Structure 1
Amino acid sequence: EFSQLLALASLLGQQQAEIQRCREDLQKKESLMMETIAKIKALALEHHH
């Protein structure tokens, strides 16, 4: 009866927990790139002025 729905709700929780881990990694790599961007900004400043 309600078996179809319960299985999809169970899969949903695994999907979300998987997506939430992917969003974590995505943001950790995003922060790492901004560190690169900042290094380029620092050299740009030192020379433009």
Structure 2
Amino acid sequence: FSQLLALASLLGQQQAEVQRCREDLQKKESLMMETIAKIKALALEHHHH
């Protein structure tokens, strides 16, 4: 049908993949901080002996 359909369908398909990578990223970023938090806790538990 209209050219709108094609674009709006492409847009909906591309936003699905943007939101897909954005949640996978937020998972990878969350694990990064968890490791950073363990590092900081270890240097604290070490200075405190």
TM-score computed with the length of structure 2 as normaliser: 0.82
SS in structure 1 of the partner of residue 40 of structure 2: helix
4+ runs deviating over 4 angstroms: none
Q: Percent identity?
A: 98
Contiguous gaps of at least 5 residues in structure 2: none
Q: Is 21-30 or 39-48 further displaced after alignment? A: 39-48
CA RMSD between the two structures? 1.8
CA positional deviation for 1:48: 6.0
TM-score computed with the length of structure 1 as normaliser: 0.82
Q: Is 27-36 or 2-11 further displaced after alignment? A: 2-11
- Equivalents in 2 of 1:48, 1:7: separation in Å? 63
Contiguous gaps of at least 5 residues in structure 1: none
